Ligand binder design. Structure first.
Ligand code: A1IDP
Length: 147
């Protein structure tokens, strides 16, 4: 459900921003996701450096527009797979790093807005495929957890 996906998206943004939230800590799914998505994010940052250096992410609306353009390109052939879902989180990590650095009126309460639209996209466009492929615990974690 939305709340579950929003918590994954929020946890990943907090991981990239170096602000882990105090308390019981991230779930097993979140821990596995942070590891795989961060690895994909680092690869994307290097491989698409010229492409990422040409944008100025001055606002949440600018980040939303950029994210939608990436999603149209990522899923243009209509196929969904777990590697593509991990790539969504990798792009939200890149967007929050650019927003911290380039946002016009830096607003600490706008990192949750990026997490929100990423969760809306995941739920609306990939949610049914995720559920049919086992959800996060029986699908995602089984595929990507350490061997
Ligand atoms: C380089 C083209 C470009 O400026 N661009 C863009 C980046 C990435 C894709 O598609 C991904 C790579 C190929 C597929 N696997 C998906 C498409 C277009 C823009 C729209 C862009 C630049 C920078 C960012 C950044 F992350 F830095 F904020 C985004 C985003 N989000 C998009």
């Amino acid at each position: 459900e939305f709340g579950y996906i929003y918590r994954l998206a929020q946890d990943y943004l907090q991981c990239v921003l170096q602000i882990p939230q105090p308390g019981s800590g991230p779930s097993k799914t979140s821990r596995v996701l942070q590891n795989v998505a961060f690895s994909v994010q680092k690869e994307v940052e290097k491989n698409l450096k010229s492409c990422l250096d040409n944008v100025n992410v001055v606002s949440v609306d600018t980040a939303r527009t950029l994210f939608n353009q990436v999603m149209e390109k990522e899923f243009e052939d209509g196929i969904i797979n777990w590697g593509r879902i991990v790539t969504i989180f990798a792009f939200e990590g890149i967007l929050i790093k650019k927003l911290l650095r380039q946002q016009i009126a830096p607003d600490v309460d706008t990192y949750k807005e990026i997490s929100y639209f990423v969760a809306e996209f995941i739920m609306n466009n990939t949610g049914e495929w995720i559920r049919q492929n086992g959800g996060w615990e029986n699908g995602f974690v089984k595929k990507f957890e350490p061997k």
